[PDB]
Design an enzyme around this catalytic site. Structure first.
Site, PDB file in Angstrom:
ATOM      1  N   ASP A  19      42.805  39.281  38.448  1.00 12.99           N
ATOM      2  CA  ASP A  19      43.261  39.893  39.749  1.00 12.99           C
ATOM      3  C   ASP A  19      43.131  41.411  39.711  1.00 12.99           C
ATOM      4  OD1 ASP A  19      43.867  37.430  40.771  1.00 12.99           O
ATOM      5  OD2 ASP A  19      46.014  37.699  40.905  1.00 12.99           O
TER       6      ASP A  19
ATOM      7  N   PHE B  53      37.025  28.850  44.414  1.00  9.71           N
ATOM      8  CA  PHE B  53      36.830  30.239  43.977  1.00  9.71           C
ATOM      9  C   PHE B  53      36.741  30.268  42.492  1.00  9.71           C
ATOM     10  CE2 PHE B  53      38.242  34.780  43.492  1.00  9.71           C
ATOM     11  CZ  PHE B  53      37.393  35.353  44.417  1.00  9.71           C
TER      12      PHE B  53
ATOM     13  N   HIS C 187      38.284  34.635  37.561  1.00  7.73           N
ATOM     14  CA  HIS C 187      38.406  36.063  37.732  1.00  7.73           C
ATOM     15  C   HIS C 187      39.710  36.529  37.155  1.00  7.73           C
ATOM     16  CE1 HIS C 187      40.803  34.312  40.987  1.00  7.73           C
ATOM     17  NE2 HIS C 187      41.493  35.449  41.006  1.00  7.73           N
TER      18      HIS C 187
ATOM     19  N   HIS D 236      41.803  33.074  35.826  1.00 11.59           N
ATOM     20  CA  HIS D 236      42.141  31.893  36.572  1.00 11.59           C
ATOM     21  C   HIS D 236      41.107  31.643  37.653  1.00 11.59           C
ATOM     22  CE1 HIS D 236      44.080  35.317  38.531  1.00 11.59           C
ATOM     23  NE2 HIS D 236      44.056  34.624  39.666  1.00 11.59           N
TER      24      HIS D 236
HETATM   25  C1  V10 Z   1      40.002  34.056  49.776  1.00  7.91           C
HETATM   26  S1  V10 Z   1      39.084  33.473  48.339  1.00  7.91           S
HETATM   27  C2  V10 Z   1      40.167  32.643  47.265  1.00  7.91           C
HETATM   28  C3  V10 Z   1      41.460  33.396  47.042  1.00  7.91           C
HETATM   29  O1  V10 Z   1      41.139  34.424  46.148  1.00  7.91           O
HETATM   30  C4  V10 Z   1      41.390  35.777  46.489  1.00  7.91           C
HETATM   31  O2  V10 Z   1      42.020  36.096  47.489  1.00  7.91           O
HETATM   32  C5  V10 Z   1      40.806  36.754  45.522  1.00  7.91           C
HETATM   33  C6  V10 Z   1      41.213  36.438  44.089  1.00  7.91           C
HETATM   34  S2  V10 Z   1      42.969  36.816  43.800  1.00  7.91           S
HETATM   35  N1  V10 Z   1      41.294  38.121  45.813  1.00  7.91           N
HETATM   36  C7  V10 Z   1      40.549  38.826  46.670  1.00  7.91           C
HETATM   37  O3  V10 Z   1      39.534  38.373  47.197  1.00  7.91           O
HETATM   38  C8  V10 Z   1      41.028  40.208  46.946  1.00  7.91           C
HETATM   39  C9  V10 Z   1      41.498  40.488  48.366  1.00  7.91           C
HETATM   40  C10 V10 Z   1      41.951  41.979  48.420  1.00  7.91           C
HETATM   41  C11 V10 Z   1      42.360  42.320  49.856  1.00  7.91           C
HETATM   42  N2  V10 Z   1      41.335  41.907  50.818  1.00  7.91           N
HETATM   43  C12 V10 Z   1      42.706  43.784  49.891  1.00  7.91           C
HETATM   44  O4  V10 Z   1      42.006  44.606  50.557  1.00  7.91           O
HETATM   45  O5  V10 Z   1      43.732  44.093  49.243  1.00  7.91           O
HETATM   46  C13 V10 Z   1      42.430  32.487  46.361  1.00  7.91           C
HETATM   47  O6  V10 Z   1      42.881  32.873  45.259  1.00  7.91           O
HETATM   48  O7  V10 Z   1      42.730  31.396  46.928  1.00  7.91           O
HETATM   49 FE   FE2 Z   2      43.560  35.586  41.725  1.00  8.67          FE
END
Ligand code: V10
Ligand code: FE2
Length: 329
Positions: free
Chosen positions: A214, A209, A212, A268
């Site tokens: 958060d 990933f 980004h 990160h």
């Molecule tokens: C699932 S992709 C990689 C994963 O990254 C995330 O979960 C990323 C960056 S923190 N955050 C998101 O995609 C947001 C999810 C928000 C959630 N679905 C919601 O509705 O709150 C990780 O940090 O291992």
């Molecule tokens: Fe994150």
């Protein structure tokens, strides 16, 4: 090649208690960590994380393909139009390795006023069949409240850290309306690991990933003991060491907005590792109508040239933009 990020371990246990001086000493550690790499580990947090990992393992390994479509969010199953946030996020063998299950506030029930109004970002959780996953829903709902508890404590420390009363954030973080979410992320071991599921950073690092900030006020994260996270600093990307006994804590961009970048949301990314592992974030979100007046703790009068932004607005835009920047998860 890559140097180790400064991620202090902070004993957050005085935040649960009534010793005010000892809470201020925790606050100071939080302030220091928040001004430096923007990450720390909360230790003595009181949550049974080995059980969390076991219960989560049992779910990921026993859910079937059939169940995943039945629980799938809209991005994977166009029948499930109300499932924008909560439900199953499928992998694509050959292309997208990661998969996950997201759930929200258990109090978002069919009679909840925000669910009745069909307010964006509020949804009723979906769960697998109890007889196929006995105990899972009750464990998962309980986990939500245990991590909610930790996060309230943490928000008392960040409040104190910023020169505010301890309820400054926490008064906006309420069981009946919090937009907080748990994501139960499964990163698989795969042999061969499809290249199409590996992104490449500008510096050549292989990633699962990309970079980004958060979408949260703060993020409260449990992961396996497999090193993977890097944080960008003025000395470049540094490796965050794994610690599967603590929670990894950082600020999201809502905190950066409120504090005028005094507590930045650290940039990160997640390195590609061919390991069967878990990443179990709790995104600490406030209520749909929660507005905190922005301020600046580096300015004598505390005033900011940023405008107030409602949490609900912040969240719905943020989550869209994250999908746009870094792809559907
Ligand atoms: C699932 S992709 C990689 C994963 O990254 C995330 O979960 C990323 C960056 S923190 N955050 C998101 O995609 C947001 C999810 C928000 C959630 N679905 C919601 O509705 O709150 C990780 O940090 O291992
Ligand atoms: Fe994150």
């Amino acid at each position: 090649s890559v140097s180790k990020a400064n991620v202090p371990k902070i004993d957050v246990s005085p935040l649960f208690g009534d010793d005010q001086a000892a809470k201020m000493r925790v606050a100071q550690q939080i302030d220091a960590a928040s001004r430096d790499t923007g990450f720390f580990y909360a230790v003595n947090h009181g949550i049974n994380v080995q059980r969390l990992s076991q219960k989560t393992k049992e779910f990921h390994m026993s859910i079937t393909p059939e169940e995943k479509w039945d629980l799938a969010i809209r991005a994977y199953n166009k029948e499930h139009q109300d499932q924008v946030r909560a439900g199953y996020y499928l992998s694509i063998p050959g292309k997208k390795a990661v998969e996950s299950f997201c759930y929200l506030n258990p109090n978002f029930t069919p009679d909840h006023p925000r669910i009745q109004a069909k307010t964006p970002t509020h949804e009723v959780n979906v769960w697998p069949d109890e007889t196929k996953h006995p105990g899972f829903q009750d464990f998962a709902e309980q986990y939500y409240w245990d991590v909610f508890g930790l996060s309230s404590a943490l928000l008392k420390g960040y409040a104190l850290a910023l020169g505010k009363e301890e309820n400054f954030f926490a008064r906006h973080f309420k069981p009946d309306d919090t937009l907080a979410s748990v994501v139960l992320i499964r990163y698989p071991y795969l042999d061969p690991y499809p290249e199409a599921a590996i992104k490449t950073a500008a510096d050549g690092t292989k990633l699962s990933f990309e970079w980004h900030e958060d979408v949260s006020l703060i993020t409260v994260l449990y992961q396996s003991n497999v090193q993977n996270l890097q944080v960008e600093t003025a000395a470049g990307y540094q490796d965050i060491e794994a610690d599967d006994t603590g929670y990894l804590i950082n600020c999201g961009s809502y905190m950066a907005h409120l504090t005028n970048n005094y507590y930045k949301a650290p940039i990160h990314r997640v390195k590609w590792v061919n390991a069967e592992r878990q990443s179990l974030p709790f995104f600490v979100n406030l209520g749909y109508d929660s507005v905190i007046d922005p301020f600046d703790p580096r300015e004598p009068n505390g005033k900011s040239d940023r405008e107030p932004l409602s949490y609900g607005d912040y969240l719905q835009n943020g989550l869209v933009s994250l999908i746009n920047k870094n792809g559907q998860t």
